[PDB]
Amino acid sequence: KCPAVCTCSKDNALCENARSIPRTVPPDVISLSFVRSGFTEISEGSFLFTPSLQLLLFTSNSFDVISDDAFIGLPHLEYLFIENNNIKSISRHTFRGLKSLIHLSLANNNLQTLPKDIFKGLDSLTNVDLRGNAFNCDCKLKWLVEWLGHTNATVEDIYCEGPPEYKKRKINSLSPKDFDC
Numbered sequence: 001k002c003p004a005v006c007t008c009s010k011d012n013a014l015c016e017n018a019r020s021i022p023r024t025v026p027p028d029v030i031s032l033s034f035v036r037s038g039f040t041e042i043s044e045g046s047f048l049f050t051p052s053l054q055l056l057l058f059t060s061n062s063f064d065v066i067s068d069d070a071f072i073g074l075p076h077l078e079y080l081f082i083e084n085n086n087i088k089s090i091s092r093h094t095f096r097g098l099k100s101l102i103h104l105s106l107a108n109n110n111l112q113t114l115p116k117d118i119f120k121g122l123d124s125l126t127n128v129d130l131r132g133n134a135f136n137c138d139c140k141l142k143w144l145v146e147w148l149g150h151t152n153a154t155v156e157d158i159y160c161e162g163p164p165e166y167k168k169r170k171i172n173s174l175s176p177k178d179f180d181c
């Protein structure tokens with residue numbers, strides 16, 4: 001029953017070089033990991049048939065887009081780790097539908113931006129790891145500083161690489177009074 005592209009441990013399954021997201025994952029598996037996967041995108045409703053997942057991991061993947069509602073149908077997901085990936089586009093409602101999500105890590109994806117209200121609706125969120133990215137200080141990321149002021153969750157210090165004059169400036173220290181838009 002363990003998917004061909006995956007190897008299953010005691011309560012966990014790990015998939016390497018998977019050409020597609022398997023929908024036949026055993027129900028007893030509560031966390032899933034995708035490493036160097038073949039598929040280039042996460043379309044909406046991909047995890048609908050694996051509702052038992054409490055933790056999800058994506059590492060060493062190259063993703064064109066992670067679209068809206070990709071993680072819909074994951075009510076029990078408390079942990080989502082997307083790290084060490086090449087992600088060209090992340091969508092506003094990507095994480096919509098995860099109200100049990102506790103720890104979310106987008107660290108080390110070399111992302112240059114995040115869409116507004118990407119963390120809206122994540123109520124159980126106690127920690128967010130945005131470190132290790134290529135964020136550029138702009139007006140469109142403006143919302144982020146506001147979200148960093150009014151957020152419960154613990155978010156470690158992150159910095160914008162550009163513009164070159166404002167390189168390595170503390171995103172957490174940044175305030176609405178600093179950027180003119």
Ligand SMILES: *[C@@H]1O[C@H](CO)[C@@H](O)[C@H](O)[C@H]1NC(C)=O
Pocket residue numbers: 123152
């Ligand atoms: C975090 O938010 C919840 C409601 O979503 C609230 O009950 C709780 O007091 C907040 N934690 C704080 C303010 O430390």
